[PDB]
RNA sequence: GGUUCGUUCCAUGGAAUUAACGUAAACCCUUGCUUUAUUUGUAAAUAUUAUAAAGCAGUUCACCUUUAUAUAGGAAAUGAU
């Protein structure tokens, strides 16, 4: 209540801080800080059968994943926008600064909205198209004949239609008869 | 005041005026048919004396918001009471710098 | 130096066909069936008109919503839920995928197959039989309440509860100016 | 495995590159008028060839579109919403409509026509129809007798609807329906 | 905007209300140069 | 009493019936039953029925007596069976299945798994290959939906070039600037 | 028999028979036709107008939701960023940039179309994609490898359970937390940013519209390449960088009119006028008796009896493979469609599509900003900067002499009309921005 | 310096070449004509009022006069239309 505050608590813990290695994380679980133990069999398998593999592929394991943090490294690096820039003059999200170049060249590749209004009414126009030349058809497959009525029908009803609306005129039945 | 809700129910341009015309337009709702009865018993020259008079005493310590000559269009972008058009629900002015940008559908400036 | 590789001809490939399309299928399929629902409400001698003007009114019960078969199954299920539940109201379908879908987003959410024998009642008692109250000839000029319930039922603009409001105080009026 | 050489094309395919055909009426009793609507003319004259072409698949014989007379609103309004009031201008508000009638329609044949119609309509289009049909004596009795047709149909679209067990949020059916028709109309 | 972040808020997303945001910085500026309103009185001058 | 008039039939000769039946059957002629079943081979089930209705409701005697060509200004510009949907020049098809109300977005641990079911995807269909890796930034989905393709509302891209605005213009900046 | 009021319809026949009468003048080409969306936001008719006068309010709220609903963002915490709090509001220039929103409605439902300029993809894409393929190509082998020591002996199986599968996938987790973070930011942010245009985060969006209209909402957003094409889109990207107090005012409407390329031209022969002369290619003036009895009747080439024969020499076939050769089909789960369908080449047809569209270039562009944009905290007076880059003249009229179609009785269908208000510390101004298309 | 309703057009200048806006063009109603449509309008009808979509039309042709030979103008109920 009162003058307002800035929530300050706003924030996400890392569920791990540092890089850790088969055996160290295995190690730390087996703890049995917070673990039940029928699940502790399973890392304790998993524990000696790693110290059980040779040492040239524990080796190659480390080996294994420097080389992807040197390949996620350009994915992390900080990119300083241009001397003269135009999009990240103010921007302090520094995971969208690009190298800016050639992101405003026309390549000839799109038309103005004007343009597009007439083409959206093209793509309707083959839709209306596909439609009287597949479905159309169908329609003669329901019809029925047309027969004249026969001299006890007498009377003659009006019935109105909207078309999906609802207006208040549509309640009206007119009937005429001689 | 007891006819206006505690609880904000327009999405229109809101005024001081505009809430009290709401509140208006709902209170004759609630109690048109109310209004219509009255109004029929002392219109009704068939029905005792006494019973027209009656009638005629209700209807005049009804609330003034129950009264439909109270209601009077505003425009719902502006809030003014003159120059409102039905067809629009705005003022003429309001009318025209809509019509002109195409945020009114079928109006369009004329010329013959 | 740092510098971005031209898009490859293979990438470009792949992005035109996300951007512009693909040649997909195209299946027609018109029946009767596929426009239920669209057609005319009218109380013709055609079943089919009678059809329409039950669909109306189940419309009517669900919402007031178009019937839209053809624009998805979505929906939102929290409103639905809660009009179907908290306030105890129909709720209308434009196709079985629908109701299904309503399903799954929801959690341990069930909802009747139809509407009961009495509701399947109430819809074509009306909108379709046309069962009405014909209005009786008053004759003398001073049978004020027979008078009144007679030009009620001859318009529809005093819905069954706007003549309530009306009879309750036309009633307090006649015995307020009685001996 | 052989290669046919088509010597033309679907009539289908062709139609689309006609005039839209048209049945020829014997007695000219019209069975329907389907008036259409909208504040521009393209769309207007478009959607009334398509609607000109499914009359003909059904076997209707349509006539028109009849330009019938334009609707043509007036305002003067000031151009300033302060006192300036020696300059106004004129706006305007011109609905364009059409016609097309049918004669000699069959009763149902005539509603597949409109329900086709509802379904593919066309975008900034108004539509109004006016259906008319021959019947007997004694309307009251052919109602009734109808009721069990009328629910063979029904059996498979009463699942569109559904509600709790004695749904208590309708309260009074008729009530229920002659106010939530006026919510959904807006009013009236 | 509030229903429509109430919507989208249960994905973890997140918007800024430029009106709002926009109305309360205005406030913070004038209770900074001490403009801002007085304290509301609940009771009749006396 | 016609619906037409004869003037334009006379002048062709074709006042008898006789010889209307002549000129339809000699420019209007039905397909043969080896066109049926080639026409039939190329086109499935579904469109061959609506070949079959159209050539059943359309007579060829209305196409003598009253088939004009059509000179409106909502004509195709062009012929073409329209039986599938195009790329560029038709409205997106809608295909997909509805999306999931419960789906979320991917935690780190759902994360990595579906990281590790792409990699065995596309290693039981060397490692990855580039068109694999372009696929999982533009297609993988990254919420808990069973990897689900909705349906796009993007209206489709035009053409690298479009006609008439190709050829025209010049880009001013020189990248040796 | 039939009935009396049967027949007193059928007498009621005085009818004007179909002349097909032959045209004896010459027919000019019809007028370039725009489209009927581009007149009015809302391109509706109903009966009942009460469906129609909330229309004008609607579309405030309705383009309220669209820019907010564009704007929407990941929570720090989701994504593990480190948020770097401040007093200040950041601008941020790097989203999805939205126009006003233009609806078709039937009695059905409502299309709304909007025009956009993605600028978060370009980011986004470009720096995702400097992942190397190491990356993916090393991680396969981390998988394959510890499955060889951890969910095997030492040097899909029966006794490899999901609660083995999930110890074996921590020990990954832990082992690369910081680079799987990472991976999983941009693709999620970049997921998001493709989301907003499908149904996973639509269906919403739908939700929240289609309480307005009470009718399902179709969108159809346009992917726009140049925020330039839409005046929209351009005067909301100006206005967000005069916001700024020590913005140039004359400088950032030069570097805009910089980035907008104009065709080259010659401008002798665009406003050279054009003569009226029969176009005798136009299918009115070729054929002067429209009806196939005359046509196909052997009138001037020898035999062209068939239908299709007459049609294949007016208008472009696909189903050809020679334009003016035969139709040759072959005669003797997967997707249904022709046999032929891969064959067609739609290489001319768009041309003709794209060559009948007018106003697809970018003719002319003007801006103008206007009001308090001083840079001191005093008061000055408003000031008034105009720019501009070709002309927003409609040439085809102004020129050629050809008849156009007016928007809205006053309009050029031509130009593209958009301002937009902001406010600096000091006041308010506005920026009104006109683009022409040619 | 002429000319034009007009910074319109022509010629010319020991300094000009071009751009934007207004202007002009185009648009809306109206006039004649062509095609389309025929109900809820039309006496009948072999289709002519009305209704309304598209297209064409003028200072166009004829006559007279005509500068610097470059750009034109006049005549107005008794040439055509
Ligand atoms: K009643
Ligand atoms: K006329
Ligand atoms: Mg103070
Ligand atoms: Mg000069
Ligand atoms: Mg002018
Ligand atoms: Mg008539």
Redesign the interface.
């Known amino acids: 209540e009162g003058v307002p505050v800035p929530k300050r608590e706003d924030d996400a813990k890392l569920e791990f801080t540092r890089p850790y290695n088969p055996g160290e994380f295995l190690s730390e679980k087996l703890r049995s800080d917070d673990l039940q133990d029928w699940e502790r069999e399973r890392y304790e398998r998993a524990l000696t059968s790693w110290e059980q593999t040779p040492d040239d592929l524990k080796r190659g394991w480390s080996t294994m994943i420097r080389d992807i943090e040197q390949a996620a490294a350009p994915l992390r690096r900080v990119v300083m926008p241009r001397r003269s820039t135009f999009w990240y003059e103010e921007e302090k999200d520094t995971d969208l600064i690009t190298n800016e170049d050639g992101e405003d060249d026309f390549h000839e590749n799109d038309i103005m909205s004007l343009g597009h209004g007439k083409l959206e009414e093209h793509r309707e126009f083959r839709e209306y198209a596909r439609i009287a030349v597949w479905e159309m058809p169908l329609l003669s497959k329901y019809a029925k004949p047309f027969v004249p009525p026969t001299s006890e029908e007498v009377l003659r009803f009006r019935y109105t239609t909207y078309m999906g609306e609802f207006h208040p005129a549509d309640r009206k039945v007119v009937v005429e008869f001689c | 005041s007891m006819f206006r809700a505690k609880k904000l129910d327009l999405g229109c341009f809101t005024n001081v005026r505009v809430l009290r015309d709401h509140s208006k337009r709902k209170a004759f709702l609630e109690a048109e048919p109310e209004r219509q009865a009255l109004r029929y018993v002392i219109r009704n020259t068939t029905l005792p004396a006494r019973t027209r008079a009656v009638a005629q005493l209700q209807l005049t310590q009804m609330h003034a918001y129950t009264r439909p000559t109270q209601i009077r269009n505003r425009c719902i972008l502006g809030g003014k009471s003159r120059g409102i058009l039905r067809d629009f629900k705005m003022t003429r002015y309001n009318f025209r710098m809509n019509a002109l940008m195409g945020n009114i559908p079928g109006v369009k400036k004329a010329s013959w | 130096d740092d510098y971005d590789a031209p898009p490859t001809e293979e990438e470009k490939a792949f992005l035109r066909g996300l951007e512009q399309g693909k040649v997909t299928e195209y299946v027609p399929k018109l029946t009767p069936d596929t426009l239920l629902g669209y057609g005319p409400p009218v109380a013709t001698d055609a079943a089919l008109g009678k059809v329409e003007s039950a669909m109306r009114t189940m419309r009517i019960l669900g919402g007031g919503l178009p019937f839209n078969d053809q624009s998805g199954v979505t929906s939102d299920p929290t409103a639905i839920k809660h009009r179907y539940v908290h306030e105890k109201k129909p709720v209308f379908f434009s196709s079985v995928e629908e109701k299904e879908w309503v399903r799954e987003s929801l959690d341990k959410f069930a909802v009747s197959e139809g509407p009961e024998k009495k509701t399947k009642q109430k819809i074509l008692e009306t909108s379709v039989l046309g069962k009405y109250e014909e209005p009786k000839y008053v004759e003398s000029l001073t049978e004020t309440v027979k008078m009144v319930e007679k030009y009620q039922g001859g318009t529809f603009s005093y819905a069954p509860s706007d003549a309530d409001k009306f009879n309750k105080k036309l009633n307090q009026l006649l015995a307020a100016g009685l001996p | 495995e052989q290669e046919v050489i088509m010597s033309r094309m679907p009539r289908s395919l062709e139609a689309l590159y006609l005039q839209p055909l048209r049945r020829e009426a014997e007695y000219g009793v019209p069975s329907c008028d389907l008036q259409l609507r909208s504040y521009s003319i393209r769309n207007l004259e478009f959607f009334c060839d398509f609607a000109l072409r499914a009359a003909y698949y059904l076997g209707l014989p349509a006539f028109g579109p009849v330009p019938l007379p334009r609707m043509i609103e007036r305002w003067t309004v000031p151009k300033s919403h302060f006192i300036f009031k020696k300059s106004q201008e004129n706006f305007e508000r011109v609905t364009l409509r059409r016609l097309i009638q049918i004669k000699d329609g069959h009763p149902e044949t005539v509603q597949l026509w409109l329900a086709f119609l509802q379904k593919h309509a066309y975008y900034g289009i108004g539509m109004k129809a006016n259906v008319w049909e021959f019947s007997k004596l004694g309307v009251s009795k052919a109602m009734d007798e109808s009721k069990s047709e009328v629910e063979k149909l029904l059996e498979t679209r009463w699942e569109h609807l559904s509600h709790v067990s004695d749904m208590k949020g309708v309260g009074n059916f008729e009530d229920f329906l002659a106010k939530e028709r006026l919510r959904i109309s807006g009013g009236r | ?1 509030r ?2 972040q109430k ?2 808020g249960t ?7 430029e009106v709002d ?1 926009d109305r ?2 205005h406030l913070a500026a004038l ?1 900074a140069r001490d403009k801002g309103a007085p304290k509301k009185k609940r009771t009749a001058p006396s | 009493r016609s619906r037409f008039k004869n003037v334009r039939a006379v002048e062709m000769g074709l006042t008898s019936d006789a010889k209307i039946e002549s000129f339809t059957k000699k420019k209007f002629a039905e397909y043969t039953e080896d066109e049926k079943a080639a026409l039939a081979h190329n086109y499935p089930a579904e469109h061959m029925e609506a070949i079959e209705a159209a050539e059943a409701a359309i007579d060829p005697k209305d196409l003598t007596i009253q088939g004009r060509l059509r000179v409106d200004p909502y004509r195709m510009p062009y012929i073409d069976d329209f039986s599938e949907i195009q790329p560029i020049i038709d409205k997106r098809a809608r295909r997909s299945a509805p999306p999931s109300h419960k789906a979320r977005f991917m935690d780190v641990d759902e994360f990595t798994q579906d990281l590790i079911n792409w990699a065995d995807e596309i290693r039981r269909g060397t490692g990855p290959t580039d068109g694999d890796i372009l696929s999982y930034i533009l297609e993988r989905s990254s919420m808990t939906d069973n990897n689900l393709q909705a349906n796009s509302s993007l209206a489709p891209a035009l053409p690298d070039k479009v006609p008439g605005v190709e050829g025209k213009y010049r880009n001013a900046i020189d990248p040796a600037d | 028999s039939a009935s009396v009021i049967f027949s007193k319809y059928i007498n009621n026949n005085n009818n004007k028979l179909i002349p097909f009468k032959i045209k004896n003048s010459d027919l000019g080409r019809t007028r370039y036709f725009p489209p009927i969306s581009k007149e009015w936001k809302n391109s509706i008719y109903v009966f009942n107008h009460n469906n129609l006068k909330n229309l004008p309010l609607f579309d405030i709220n309705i383009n309220s939701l669209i820019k907010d609903y564009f704007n929407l963002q990941f929570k720090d915490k989701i994504l593990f960023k480190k948020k770097r709090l401040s007093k200040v509001k950041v601008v941020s220039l790097n989203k999805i940039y939205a126009s006003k929103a233009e609806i078709k409605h039937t009695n059905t439902k409502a299309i709304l179309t909007v025009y956009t300029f993605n600028r978060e993809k370009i980011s986004l894409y470009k720096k995702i994609k400097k992942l190397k393929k190491s990356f993916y190509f090393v991680f396969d082998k981390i998988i394959s490898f510890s499955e060889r020591v951890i969910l095997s002996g030492v040097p899909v199986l029966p006794w490899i359970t999901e609660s083995h599968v999930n110890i074996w996938r921590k020990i990954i987790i832990a082992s690369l937390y910081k680079e799987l973070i990472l991976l999983r930011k941009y693709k999620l942010r970049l997921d998001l940013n493709k989301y907003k245009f499908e149904e996973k985060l639509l269906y919403r969006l739908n939700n929240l519209i289609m309480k307005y209209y009470n009718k399902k909402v179709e969108f159809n957003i346009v992917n726009m390449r140049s925020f330039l094409l839409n005046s929209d889109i351009l005067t909301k990207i100006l206005a967000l960088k005069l916001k700024n107090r020590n913005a140039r005012v004359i400088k950032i409407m030069d570097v805009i009119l910089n980035k907008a390329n104009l065709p080259k031209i010659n401008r002798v022969q665009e406003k050279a006028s054009l003569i009226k002369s029969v176009d005798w290619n136009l299918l009115e003036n070729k054929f002067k008796n429209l009806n196939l009895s005359f046509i196909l009747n052997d009138a001037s080439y020898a035999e062209r009896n068939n239908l299709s024969e007459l049609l294949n020499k007016l208008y472009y076939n696909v189903l050809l493979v020679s334009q003016k050769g035969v139709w040759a089909l072959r005669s003797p789960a997967q997707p249904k469609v022709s046999s032929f369908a891969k064959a067609k080449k739609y290489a001319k047809i768009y041309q003709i599509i794209f060559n009948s569209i007018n106003y697809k270039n970018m003719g002319g562009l003007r801006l103008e900003i206007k009001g308090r944009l001083t840079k001191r905290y005093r008061a000055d007076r408003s000031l008034f900067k105009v720019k501009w880059k070709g002309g927003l003249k409609n040439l085809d009229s102004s020129y050629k002499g050809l008849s156009s179609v007016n928007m809205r009785g006053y309009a050029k269908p031509n130009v593209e009309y958009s301002i937009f208000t902001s406010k600096r510390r000091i006041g308010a101004f506005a920026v009104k921005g006109w683009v022409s298309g040619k």
Do not use: C, Q
Not at chain 5, 11 to 17: I, N, P, S, Y
């Open positions: 905007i229903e429509l919507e989208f994905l973890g997303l997140e918007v800024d209300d945001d309360l910085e209770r």
